[PDB]
Design a protein around this ligand. Sequence first.
Ligand SMILES: Cc1ncc(COP(=O)(O)O)c(CN)c1O
Ligand SMILES: Cc1ncc(COP(=O)(O)O)c(CN)c1O
Lengths: 420, 420
Amino acid sequence: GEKSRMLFERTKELFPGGVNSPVRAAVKPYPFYVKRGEGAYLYTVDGARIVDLVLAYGPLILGHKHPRVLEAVEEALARGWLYGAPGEAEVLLAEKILGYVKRGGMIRFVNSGTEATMTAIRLARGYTGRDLILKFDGCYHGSHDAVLVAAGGVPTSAGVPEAVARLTLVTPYNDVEALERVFAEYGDRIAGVIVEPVIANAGVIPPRREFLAALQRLSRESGALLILDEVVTGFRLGLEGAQGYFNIEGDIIVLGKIIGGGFPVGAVAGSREVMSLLTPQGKVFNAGTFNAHPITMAAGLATLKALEEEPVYSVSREAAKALEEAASEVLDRTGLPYTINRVESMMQLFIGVEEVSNAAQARKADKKFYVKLHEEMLRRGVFIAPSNLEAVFTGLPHQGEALEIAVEGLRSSLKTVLGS
Amino acid sequence: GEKSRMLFERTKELFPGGVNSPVRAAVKPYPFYVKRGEGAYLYTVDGARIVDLVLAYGPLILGHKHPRVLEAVEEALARGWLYGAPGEAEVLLAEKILGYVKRGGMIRFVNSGTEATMTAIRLARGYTGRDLILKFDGCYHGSHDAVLVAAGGVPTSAGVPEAVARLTLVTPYNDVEALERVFAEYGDRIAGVIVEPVIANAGVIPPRREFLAALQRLSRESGALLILDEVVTGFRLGLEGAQGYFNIEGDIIVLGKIIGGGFPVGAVAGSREVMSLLTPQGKVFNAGTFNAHPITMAAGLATLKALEEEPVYSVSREAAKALEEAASEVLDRTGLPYTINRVESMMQLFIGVEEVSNAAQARKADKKFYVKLHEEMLRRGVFIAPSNLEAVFTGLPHQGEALEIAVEGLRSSLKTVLGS
Ligand SMILES: Cc1ncc(COP(=O)(O)O)c(CN)c1O
Ligand SMILES: Cc1ncc(COP(=O)(O)O)c(CN)c1O
């Protein structure tokens, strides 16, 4: 790992914490640098092939450099990559996305999930004329002030004015009693309730039907808009995402990751009535030099076509199931308390706890055990998130030999850590 | 324009205002759709070649599909386009950028100018422990709450809480007296003063030396960080940007557009002391799935190399000068009040006013005349921003025949509008 070591030294003084995104710094023993990626694999700068169970944290459900997407991007590149005026790809991608998540509605393309949720929140506030936003402990919506808050709302990041943080309410995920209580107290001032249909940034945590039911009922009865943050679930839990998977409906649907094919993206979709408030039609401001970036649009379009024509969902589901069954077989024999949460192709293991239905329980999981597992798996050529609070993602290339390596790696790594 | 007309009809119900960014909707008679771009030209879906004096509003100083950048991106695409872990290109681009704008400092790559200024503001607040941010009337820093404010600070966009807007102070650009007064009253609570060294979103407005002097003095004496928003000026006003061009120094330098080569990008650069507050090193949060996107990094790196090895600055400067001289020759003969502001390769014409040193004066310019000019120029195959408040940008391909067409087009269009 000499080459990665050298790069590690160079970035120490170039980037805060040596990385451009926090999670990247936690890789053990130290972050490896990537030369390239193809299919189910990442290849380090030193030349090592690694099975990728991170998939850039969600966007790469089709794996690395998917042939169909590569070809579409090559064609798009030949046409120039930035115009500053409308292109064809954005129209086709919008029509395809809306047909699955909000028929007859509108969409606005942005450049990150952070920009997307931020825009959704401004839209909900503009539509209702209210200030307060309700989020849940453990849910992650990006790097912007309004969502960098925790229940005393107080800032979880420095540089966030307390005056801003106090406009965001926070209650536990899957806690119906707490949800009813917050609406009883502040309901008429809540502009929107934002939530991940399946938590992906506090490990993976599935929603309780009762929680989903309350979210829809309380939002509708209070006048608050239900903002489903489907940046991760969108197009991962089937073509119709969380709405179709759980049979729920959101007022505003925030999308990202997958819809960009691997390129910078974010999107806000909703009814014509709500979406029409966005500039230049309405007074809720949103603009972006890179909005509807030609390459992002071409990549996303090709990606969704693959999701419609290739067995991505079945393959990804089976891959995650195989990993879950393998880990469960080993862990069940130990008699140690543990739980694995899986929803289709997103999952995570929690050692030390028998149930994880909220962030508080996820935080009680054995972090040391997880870190050791991450390191041992990497030593065996399999890459899983370095943080127990991140998720494990599967995709199209996780089949055949690649899957065999991942499963065998997981089995052996668990045994090694359990034997230490 | 049948094909653009058809697309126009399709997007009416897909996007708010029919576009993904406000300015795009103002093109006359209606927005044309782009098939591709190459060199100094955009090509409509109907097949018409148009000289591009918009350059995607700043990023394309090298023109469309620059050969060097295209090759670098092709090589990068073959390596996969998203890893979720550190790559080589981000290291090289960071080293090159910092060598020109903040030697010995640090940088953090994000996905838009909006994310960049938003991150800079959070950093300034975190570093100083203060809440207030000072901006100037007419300056544009992106699509986020803290900068969508105007002096009563009150919201300029719906959906922005008044509690948030009041944390942003606003005074006129180039107004030293007003600047001194605001610091005398609120100085000890100002975390940072953000400003465009050259305004590009209220037409083009150059800074007064006295204003630049006051900005540096007052920030230093008050403890507020001077945030130079160089999203547009960075790498356009020479390799050293505004700091080198005007011989000024900022505490935090916000970059974007050009440094991404045409791909989604944004960046915050500053001293190690300030930048070290960013996660995972410090407590000022910033994370991004697409931060340091492999393709953006490769494109930006190749772009900066071109800026160092090709006569981009001289060619672009001469192009803008030729346009300015041509327009001035025609307008001087009319005796009508007007002014053209130009700083290297960025400029704008203001009809009806003899001086434009601030946003208030820019707003007094004859908008109807400008719109007619935009439409007439487009009819003659030359594309300038549809809004008088946007800027005209020149670049490397604006030479030879392309420049002749632009200049002749400007001359003829002015005469036609002046004769109507
Ligand atoms: C649900 C959710 N929302 C928002 C984001 C942030 O997306 P981005 O990093 O592109 O700003 C993420 C990524 N962790 C996410 O999982
Ligand atoms: C000075 C400045 N700052 C910020 C921005 C916004 O950049 P972006 O559109 O990528 O969010 C712009 C683009 N108009 C700008 O000119």
